[model samples]
Target: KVFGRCELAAAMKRHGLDNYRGYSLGNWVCAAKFESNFNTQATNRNTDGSTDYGILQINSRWWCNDGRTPGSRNLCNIPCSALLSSDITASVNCAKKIVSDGNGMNAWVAWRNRCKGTDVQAWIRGCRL
Candidate 1:
């Protein structure tokens, strides 16, 4: 399922990503938009030997185990498949762990190129939350 931008913003905020670890809800919303276009079933395999999954594109190298990436740390302790669930609860939860791992919100290259150091409030302008 693909979420509307406002819907994703509200969902991310409602799930406790509002200023999570000092990153704004807009920051995360921006990442979600670029990372997977808010599609819960999105998947990208990396050249570095890992795969990114779900809305946030949480990776198998560390945050999840895809049963394919060798030496996966599985830091979130959940199967990578869980990230693809349309509910997004597990995907968001894993992303929380990813952010807490000392990277803040820079774990996603998409966020680095687009969201970081930019005002993303417009992304959530219509979000009531």
Candidate 2:
């Protein structure tokens, strides 16, 4: 079902989020609308000579500086660049892990709430969908 929008939808599928509503994509889309009018390729250069890339506006350093886990200690950092690789599934999976691992859906809920109205984070905390 998620044949076209790879990273957009695949990640949601991995987390058992069948629909995009109230998911990361929706929240991100709302954030993108404010940041760059929802442009997936939106980017800009900083005075320090760095660039933010793709829909998530991920920084390049995040992709090249960090090391790996104990089981797989790769020399390079994770492929944190949005849309850098054709494997959008991997990219979305990475973002999902980032949000869920640390704060679960509440983290995502907070971001979404930030894009919208009040502190709706509590509205979604502990609620699994």
Candidate 3:
């Protein structure tokens, strides 16, 4: 599921990602741009033997349990497969858990490198949220 920019923004906001941990919906929008391009099934495997999953590319090592990581915290207590679907609520919820745990949005590498310093306001331009 590849979402348009504002579509993703609206979806994430509906799930209360707006201003979660001082990060705006646009920040989440921007983070998703580079993370998975808003593709629900997107995935990336790490060199250290962890896999990133879904729209926000959460890690198997510390977030979702993929059953392959040597020692997974499974902080979100969710199976990795659950995130790769049309239902994005679990992804947003898992993301909230990530931010709620004190990492904020810094847990995402692309967010730090790309969305961290940008004018994310532009990302949600006409959504009027």
Candidate 4:
């Protein structure tokens, strides 16, 4: 789904992710903005031969299976393409798992490098929820 920031915020709230995994909604909103600009179909090829999938850019190496990528841990037990769809339930669930196993949102480089330590209130500006 190509969502506006407010729309994404509403959806995140609907998904019960406002403070998911101990991270604030602003954290997720900011991360998603830098991660994929709320584009569900976003994908990124990593130098390590892994690929990032979906809005949050979950990595294929340890999170989701991209089929062609070998040695995928498939920790989410779902196809990487599933995350590329408009429905982000699987991707969000996978991200929660990643946060639990990894170092919070630091698992996403974009989150740490771009969203962290910034005033991200703009990401959810004007949202009703």
Candidate 5:
């Protein structure tokens, strides 16, 4: 499901992502926009043959596996497809684990290029949350 930016922000905030693991909600919202444009089913193939999964674009190379992929770290112990659900529960849980691993939001190149050091308030602008 593709979500509006404000709706995404509000949903994420209610999901306890407003200030998860020392990272700001604005940063997470920005990353979600740049990475997947708030599309729950979004997926992308990377040059390294790994696929990015879900709104956060969690990579299959080291995070989750699509089952067909070989030797994936599967750190989150989830199927990559699970991250595509609109519910976002599994995706958020895996993302939390990813952030706690010391990479923080740096795990996403989109975050580095777009969200880092930028004023991300616009992500939640006009949102009731």
Candidate 6:
């Protein structure tokens, strides 16, 4: 979060997430708490626990394994090694995939719900996929 807020906000916007949503940041933080307590280098014994990873919690082990490569530079802009392997949209898209697959409020939904009815910021409130 040391990076500029506008950069982060723009990145989230590029991923179709609402910046003003309180829950968006909350959920991402919460996901970090539940998944690895916000540990980017956190790794489960058998990659168990949950289906996502990193800060935005991209479900790399199960959500397609697209960013699990060691030394991945995709998350350079995010300023958190907790999300080094994923870009803004990759993490969001992976979360979107999980939400579409029946997971509840996976990141995207968090933003949608918190920013409900705020024009261009409420797509995931109570809707599926």
Highest TM-score: give the candidate number.
1
| TM-score for each predicted model, relative to the true structure | 0.96, 0.43, 0.95, 0.95, 0.94, 0.40
The C-alpha RMSD of each candidate to the native structure, in angstroms, is 0.9, 8.6, 1.0, 1.0, 1.1, 9.8
lDDT of each: 0.89, 0.42, 0.91, 0.87, 0.88, 0.42
True-vs-predicted CA distance for residue 98, candidate 2, Å: 3.8
lDDT of 6 by residue, 1-129 (tens): 222234444455556654323335434433334444434444442334333445444544444443344433332233233444534454555555555555455433433454333443222233222
Sort by lDDT, best first.
3, 1, 5, 4, 6, 2
* Tens-place lDDT digits, model 1, residues 1-129: 999998888888888988989888888888999999999999998999899999999989888888999877898899999999878889889888889988788788899999988888878886788
Clashing pairs in 3: none
Superposed model 1: Cα runs more than 4 Å off: none
| lDDT, residue 112, candidate 5 | 92
Determine which window of 10 residues in candidate 1 has minimal summed lDDT: 120-129
Which tens-of-lDDT digit does each residue in 1-129 have in candidate 4?
798888888888888778888788889989888889899999999998999998899999998888878877899999999999898788788888988885888898889999888887767778888
By summed lDDT, which 10 consecutive residues of candidate 3 come out lowest?
A: 99-108
lDDT of 1: 0.89
Model 4: runs farther than 4 Å from truth? none
Once fitted onto the true fold, the runs of candidate 3 whose alpha carbons sit more than 4 angstroms away are: none
Find the candidate with the highest lDDT and give its number: 3
Per residue, candidate 5 scores C-alpha lDDT tens digits across 82-129 of: 999988888888888898888778888889988999998877878888
**lDDT, candidate 2, 34-85, per-residue tens:** 4334345556554555454444444443332222222332122454343344
Q: Who is ahead in lDDT, 4 or 5?
A: 5
lDDT for residue 108 in candidate 6, whole number 0-100: 37
